Write a protein that binds this ligand. Structure first.
Ligand code: ANP
Ligand code: ANP
Ligand code: LDA
Ligand code: LDA
Ligand code: LDA
Ligand code: LDA
Ligand code: MG
Ligand code: MG
Lengths: 324, 248, 324, 248
């Protein structure tokens, strides 16, 4: 090389620094925002362990995690399927978690101890992803595998919509909070899910090299020494697990794992060693903001993230393609 | 000193059954018409494909190498490849290096193919030849004996097309250098005169089968060439050039 | 030599004959199936004149029309944007129509004379497609145009969801029938719409040549004498018109303009000279079958097409990629 | 009989300002190194691009031709093109014909390039050479004077690469016939010897600018070639073949 490593490395580090600082500020923002603004001064008062410890601290944390997860999953899939519209809830995994949830309610008669439902959601996701693996191991072309996945998702939609037809315990709003996402009822009880997300997130970020190789030809990558038939399976696995836990934790969340990686690329983040971490911080920040604006935007009740997320994101999004 | 060894290698009705050997410091050329199946055989040799027959590389058979270990002792260049989007040259190149530590090497090797000034350009924004040289440069860097003591074989599918005369000459010097440093090199060539001048051994092919194999001088004989391509060919030798003319 | 050119022609005609015959049978099917099976013999009785004339016949016709429209629109977009997932409700037009509808109800206070609502829907569709044209005329690359279009769709989603929040006449059943499609209340009163669909359908089907040219390179086509910057505009226009009338007529209908053209291609219909008419006839039948299954499947009420469509289609769909 | 006329054609720092003319029945070769800017000039001549300078085609200017009438009097072959999916050869070819009525023509022209047996095969399932021949045959059918009285120009960007010796020779026959029937033909060639043997007029280019232009034998002089490529060149004439050797 000439000097390019310094120019590009320096601009990369500046980007990541900015993104992380934004995320921290969003953290303190949500840790204080709500019905009653609690300035850092009064963070240890009795109105601090209730509003800033057993309430916003785990919800905000879960938001950062799920946002990071979704955005990374986005990046990965878009690069695996070689297609712009690759989202995470596009192979049915997001819908599979739902079928698992309802299966749990109905079967369990609705007397489960809450967490049993979260576990079922993870199970639905795992089922689907495993099926997906059997469809990929057959050496099917990516073009065909994707289609097969879309189709799985289409089946699962029709499957969970039917189970809702018999359930007596069909709650009117819980459906809308589950199908547009929300962290309203998220306490430390969900701590296990938050743990289950961390390792996979870390690991998948470290994996920039093989994604930089996938960015070339299928063949150039095989030749440079990548095991495609493996990495494809791994990626689908990791993605499905992350989407699975996210849904088990907050429900079906869109927009993030579609736009957040596009926006980053449109701003010139091509390299994966900067895009993978980029996606995590931006995804986490975007979601956090959408949460801070979905819980205290309507004195009446709590909006679902699938509203505020798109409501603000897409306007801003057009503003970036329109000219920039 | 045999690095590669093929026996009864076959593939449908597009590549009949062959058996040959690839020597350690030698340049081997694959010559033959469209439909001879050079690209198929080369791909097989590279481990990109499995199928009929069996071939052994560095005392072991291909169907037993890790995708990662193979790319240390072997570098392969597909016939046609589309450049990645907004991927700067320097990045594409450094992505092929096993030892990213060696930057002098990247400058020497890229410099030989006249890529000095172009290190900062995106790869989808080059001339055809320029890109071709970028590909050639990466594959050399991946198997350069000056930074890789595991590098041995080096396959190349018609890597000379779209390269100007000067560049052709430059790549010739490079491949000669690699061959002298104990590195096998196998490649297709549609330029008979070129093969006659720079190839050690050739493998004449037709309809999938092997017609002749051996010294470039014992393979590219007017009757052989008449069988393979279907046209008379006269030899001639001036000032030590041994050119090859066609009677069309 | 050149028996091939003709060979494929015989197989083409056989396929189209099969599809059309299937479509006729579907026609007589719905014309008789229902609450009370009316055999073709008793079609002139007073029961025939009320059930098989001002009830099933104009509803069945609309269904055939919309099904053909959706599938064709699917095929056209998938080949225009160079992408498998191109659907019709993907550039917002489907959502645009909705925004128009609601705007109509709220503004009109909810006293409109029905037909005014259809016009509103068509208006929303035109607004969007018009915008899309301004985004295309700027010489934007296909990839960029698609992304911007998706983004418009996301905005319209977030807009349409807000208007439903301030409306008294929000019926749960009517929302679900409009967002998953339904021909429940379709009389001869809707005849004008059925007309507005016909010419564009005919016209777009005649247009196989330029699409066979799009099927090669952007550049091969431009040099062979195609005006890309024109055809792109035309296609977006036609597609928007068809989707618009379709939504104004039956609501949001998915699946069809996504699966029906993929399926047809997997069975080896590559040439557009056969795929465009193929898509119309197949698209018509699939939709027609689903209506025959959504109006007499539940004695209680009428299911929405977005259920039965995916419910039967996806299972069968997987069955074709699984092996075939 | 001047079919094309270029004046002050330019494009950024990748194609300096040129001005030449193309006569009706002369095979013009564009020669020059990687980075000379042949593909750029050719594409511009095809009307695929707009920009600085102006050029006139058939007594009318390019910027005043409709994409459709233009494809009647001009056929262009880009340097690289990717084959469409599951598109049978016969279909790809017949898609370029303005007069689909003439099927005998498709058999003779496809027959010349040895595409007889392959008419029924999909295009993404060919050798590199085979596909390249398919492209060449389509573009010929699109401008063949035996079925198009409107055909005049025919641009070709390195259409000889990846073609075996025999096929190369066959195409030489084809283009020879078209030029004899009064059809301008312009193409880049990196094979100097081939230009010397088959081209009427040549355009030597370097760094975007034009170095020499005229009779192929007054253009490809060792001193000119020394400026363009940067290397000594000896001319030679044995048995009446006029080859071109390099002193490397
Ligand atoms: N997309 C692009 N953007 C910017 N510069 C470009 C682009 N494509 C090519 N160039 C430059 O334009 C010049 C001419 O390219 P080109 O017209 O292909 O020359 P050429 O004679 O065809 N070389 P070659 O194709 O190897 O035989 C070169 O210096 C290229 O670097
Ligand atoms: N996808 C395919 N399906 C079927 N046959 C194929 C396919 N690809 C190539 N072939 C055939 O395989 C044979 C040899 O292919 P290939 O290995 O490219 O030969 P080649 O020596 O490289 N010819 P060339 O590239 O023109 O120098 C030819 O007869 C082709 O028709
Ligand atoms: C300003 C820095 C933010 C503090 C970082 C938050 C990490 C909290 C982890 C503690 C786990 C809480 N606990 C023990 C109840 O599980
Ligand atoms: C085979 C994997 C087994 C995973 C099951 C793990 C159960 C953890 C969930 C228990 C809930 C934690 N709790 C009770 C504090 O809420
Ligand atoms: C191929 C099937 C053709 C069916 C065409 C029947 C359409 C006639 C409709 C006329 C309606 C007149 N009206 C409104 C008084 O009923
Ligand atoms: C804006 C130009 C077109 C005008 C739109 C309205 C024309 C068709 C609507 C007529 C309604 C038909 N019908 C049967 C209800 O009377
Ligand atoms: Mg080949
Ligand atoms: Mg070029």
């Amino acid at each position: 090389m000439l000097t390019l490593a310094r120019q590009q490395q320096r601009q990369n580090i500046r980007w990541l620094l900015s993104l992380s600082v934004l995320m921290l500020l969003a953290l303190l923002l949500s840790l204080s925002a709500g019905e009653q603004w609690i300035s850092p001064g009064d963070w240890f008062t009795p109105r601090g362990e209730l509003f800033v410890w057993q309430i916003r601290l785990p919800r905000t944390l879960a938001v950062l995690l799920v946002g990071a997860a979704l955005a990374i999953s986005g990046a990965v899939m878009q690069a695996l399927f070689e297609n712009p519209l690759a989202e995470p809830g596009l192979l049915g995994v997001s819908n599979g978690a739902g079928v698992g949830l309802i299966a749990a309610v109905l079967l369990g008669q609705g007397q489960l101890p809450n967490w049993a439902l979260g576990l079922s959601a993870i199970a639905g996701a795992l089922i689907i992803t495993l099926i997906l693996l059997r469809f990929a191991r057959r050496h099917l072309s990516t073009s065909r595998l994707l289609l097969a996945g879309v189709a799985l998702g289409i089946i699962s939609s029709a499957l969970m919509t039917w189970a809702i037809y018999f359930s007596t315990s069909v709650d009117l709003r819980q459906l809308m909070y589950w199908m547009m996402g929300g962290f309203g009822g998220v306490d430390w009880r969900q701590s296990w899910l938050m743990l289950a997300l961390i390792p996979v997130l870390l690991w998948i970020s470290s994996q920039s090299r093989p994604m930089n190789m996938l960015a070339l030809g299928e063949i150039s990558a095989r030749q440079l020494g990548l095991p495609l038939w493996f990495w494809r399976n791994v990626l689908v696995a990791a993605t499905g697990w992350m989407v699975g836990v996210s849904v088990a934790l907050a429900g079906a969340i869109g927009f993030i794992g579609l736009v957040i990686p596009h926006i980053l690329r449109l701003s010139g983040l091509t390299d994966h060693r900067v895009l993978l971490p980029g996606c995590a911080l931006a995804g986490a920040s975007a979601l956090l903001l959408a949460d801070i604006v979905a819980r205290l935007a309507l004195a009446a009740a709590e909006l679902p993230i699938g509203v505020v997320t798109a409501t603000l994101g897409a306007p801003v999004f057009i503003w970036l393609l329109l000219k920039a | 000193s045999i690095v590669m060894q093929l026996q009864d290698v076959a593939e449908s009705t597009r590549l009949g059954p062959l058996s040959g050997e690839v020597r350690a410091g030698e340049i081997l050329h694959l010559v033959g018409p469209n439909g001879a199946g050079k690209s198929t055989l080369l791909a097989r040799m590279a481990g990109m494909t499995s199928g009929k027959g069996s071939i052994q590389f560095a005392g072991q058979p291909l169907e037993a190498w890790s995708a990662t270990k193979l790319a240390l002792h072997r570098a392969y260049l597909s016939q046609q490849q589309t450049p990645p989007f907004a991927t700067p040259v320097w990045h594409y190149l450094t992505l092929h290096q096993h030892d990213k530590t060696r930057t002098e090497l990247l400058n020497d090797v890229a410099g030989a193919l006249a890529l000095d000034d172009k290190l900062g350009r995106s790869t989808n924004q080059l001339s055809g030849g320029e890109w071709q040289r970028v590909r050639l440069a990466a594959v050399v860097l991946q198997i350069t004996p000056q930074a890789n003591p595991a590098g041995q074989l080096l396959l190349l599918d018609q890597p000379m097309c779209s390269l100007d005369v000067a560049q052709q000459s430059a790549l010739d010097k490079i491949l000669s250098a690699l061959s002298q440093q104990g590195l096998a090199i196998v490649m297709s060539s549609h330029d008979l005169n070129h093969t006659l001048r720079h190839a050690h051994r050739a493998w004449l092919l037709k309809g999938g089968k092997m017609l002749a194999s051996g010294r470039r001088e014992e393979v590219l004989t007017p009757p052989n060439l008449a069988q393979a391509y279907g046209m008379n060919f006269r030899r001639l030798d001036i000032e030590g050039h041994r050119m090859l003319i066609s009677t069309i």
